[PDB]
Amino acid sequence: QGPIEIKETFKYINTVVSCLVFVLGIIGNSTLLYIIYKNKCMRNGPNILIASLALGDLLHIVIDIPINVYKLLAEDWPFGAEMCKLVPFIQKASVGITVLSLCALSIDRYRAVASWSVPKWTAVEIVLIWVVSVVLAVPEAIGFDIITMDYKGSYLRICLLHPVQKTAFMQFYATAKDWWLFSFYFCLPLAITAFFYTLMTCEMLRKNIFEMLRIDEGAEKLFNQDVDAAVRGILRNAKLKPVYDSLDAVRRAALINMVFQMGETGVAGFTNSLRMLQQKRWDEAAVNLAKSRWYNQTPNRAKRVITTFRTGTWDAYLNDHLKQRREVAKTVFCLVLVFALCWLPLHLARILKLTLYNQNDPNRCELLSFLLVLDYIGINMASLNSCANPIALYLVSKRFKNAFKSALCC
Template sequence: MWTAAFILCLGNIFICGDASDQRAEPVRQTNASDLLMLEILKYNSSLPPLRAGPKTSHPPMCLESAGIRDAFKYINTLVSLVVFVVGIVGNSTLLRIIYANNCMRSGPNVLIASLAVGDLIHIVVDIPINAYRLMAEDWPFGVVLCKLVPFLQKTSVGITVLSLCALSVDRYRAVVSRNQIKGAGVSAWTATEIILIWIISILLAVPEVVGFDMITMEYKDKHLRICLLHPMQTSLFIRLAPLDTTCNLVSHLSCAVVIFCWHINLNVSNLPFQRREVAKTVFCLVVVFAVCWFPLYLSRILKSTIYDEKDPSRCQLLSIFLVLDYFGLNMASLNSCINPIALFVVSKRFQRCFKCSLYGEKNSLQIKYICHSNSSFHRIRVLCHKRKETMFSR
C-alpha cells in the first residue's frame, strides 16, 4: 500500500503539472480536428480547455479515435445504468440502516452516511447527464445545468476524499488511544467534521460554477452547443482553480488516507472486535477508492509523459490512451456505487442489517446484529424495526 500511496501522489502531481503546462500554451483556434478533444471535454470536465486564437496547422484527425468513442458510447451507457441502479439502491439502503437503527448511529457510520449522501447526489444528477452528453453531440440542458453538473462532480469528490480522511483520522485516534469505546450517537466533534467536510467541498467546487459555460462552435454547417470550462476566461484564478484545487486535494489527502489506513491495518490485531472491524472497513473503503481512480490517474500520467499531439504517427498511441481514459472514467464512476457493496462484504454488522432490510418482516426475528454497550459486545435479538413505517413512512 505504500507503493499505492506513492503512485497516487505521483499521478496527481503529473496530472496537475500537465494541466498547468497546457494552460500556458499559446491560444489557438478550435477547428474540426479539435472536435474529438472537445467531445472528451464534454464527458470529463477535468481536462483543460482549448482556447481561441491564431490559426495553427494540425495533423490530420485520427479516425480510429472517433471509432473508439463510438464503441465506448454503449459501454459507458451500460456502466452508467449499473451505477445508477446499484448506487441508488445501495446508498439508499445504507442510509435507511443508519437512520433506523440506533445501534448503527456511531461516529464512523455517520461519516459513511455523509459519504453516501454525496454519492447519491452525484448519481441522481450527474450520471444520467454524463451518459447523455457522451452519446449526443449537442448540450440541450442550458447554462444552469452546465455549471451545476461539474460543481456537483467536484463536490462529490471532495466529500469522498475528506470523509475518508476523517474516517482514517478517527480510526487512527481509536488505535492510539486505549479509551473505552463510546456508545451509539453522534458527538459534537463528528457533527462538526461533517459540516466542515461539506462546506470545504462546496467552496472548492465554486470555481466550477464561475468557470464553466456553454459555448457554440461551427462543425459541418451545424451549431453545436458544448459545455466546458470557458476558453476565454480572463481571470487567472478561474482558469487554474477548478482543476488545480481538486488535484491538490486528491493528491495530498489520498496519500495521507492510504498511509493512515496502512498504519491502522498493521495495528488492528490487538484491538477489540468492534474497533478491528471498523478499522478494516475504513481500510477497505480507501482501497476501493484507490482502485477505482487509479486507471484514470495512470492514463493521464502516460498521456502527459508519452503522447505528443503534433506527432503525425500519434493515432495508434492515441487509441490506446483513449481506451485507458474511457476505462478510467467508467471505473471512477463505479466508486459512487461500490461503497455499500464493500461494506456488505467486509462488515458483518452491515451484512445483517442489509439482509434485514431486504428480507423485511418475514425474517426479521431471525436476523441478529452486534450492538455494543461501552466496551463490551452483546449479540442481541432484534426485530430490525419490524414496523416498516419507521423506515418508510416518514
C-alpha cells in the same frame, strides 16, 4: 480510425455502465442511508461519515448521471447554461465529500487506538467535509459555460471551461485544474489514508501484544519497553532471529510471548518446532508444540500461543472491545482501498496524457488510442465507485451485511 472507433464502442459500454451505476447506486446508497437511520445500533462516528458519503454519491448519481449519459451520446448540449454549471460542480463536490470523508475515516481509526486517548467531533467533521468540498467545487460552476456555434445552417451547443478565463484566479484554476484534480482528489486521500493506516496498525499491534501479555502474564505499564527489549534479544540470538524474521507480526508476538515466559534460552530449545515455524508449517508446529513440557505445565497459555501461531490472528487474545475496533478499521480501509482502485485508471490516464503528449503525429496515434481506451475505462471505474460502497460494506462488514438483509430481504 482508432479515435472514432473507440468512442463509438464506449458509447455503448458507458451507457450500460452508467445505467447500472444509476440503478445500483440509487438502491444501494438509499438503503445505506436507511439502515443507518433506522438502526439505532448502527449510529456511530464512522457510520455517520459513511452516510454523508452515501448522500454525496447519491447527489452525483441523480443529478449528473442521466445528463452524462446523454452528453456522451449527443454532440449538442440541450440542458442549458444552468445544468452545466451545476453538473461539474456536483461532480467535484461529491468526489470531494468522498475524499474528505475517507480522510476523516482513516484519522478517526487512528485516534480510536491512539495512546493519547468526540461525539461533537464527528459533527464538526461532517460540516467541514461538505463546506470544504462545496467551496473547492465552486470554480467549476464559475468557469463552465455554453459556447454556441453557428455556421451554414447548423448550430452546436458545447459546454466547456475555456482554457482562457476572465479573471486571474479562474485563469490559474483552468490551467492548474488537471494537476489539481490529481493532487487533491487522489494523491491527498491516498497519502493521508495510507499514513494513518500504517500508524494505526502499528498502534493496534502494540495494543494487541499488551492485551496478550496481560491475559497470559496476569498492573504493569512497563510492558511496551519490555516487549521492545525482548525483540532486541530475539534479534540477538542466532537461534531465534531466523524464525522471527520469517514470522508475521502476530506470530512474532506469540514468539515474544514464549520469550517472556521462558527466556531466550528456553525458547531456543524448541529447535524442531522453530524450524517448522520457519517452514510455515503451522499445524505441524502446533502439534509438536502441544506435546511438550511447556504445554504440560501451562496448558491454557500454551493452547492460546499455539493457536495464535497456527491461526495467525489474535482470536485467542482479542477481547470484544478490540474485536469491534478491528472489524470497523477493516471496513473503513476497505472503502479506502475500493476508492483507490476505482480512481486509479482515470487519474493514471489523465496524468499520462498530461505528461507524455509530445504532439508528434507518428507517436500520437497509437498512444492516443491507448490513452483514450484507458480514459474511458477510467471514467467507468469512477462511476462504479459512486455505487461500490453499499456492495463493499455488505461484503466486508458482518454488521452491514445483516443490516442490509434486514432492510431488504425481509
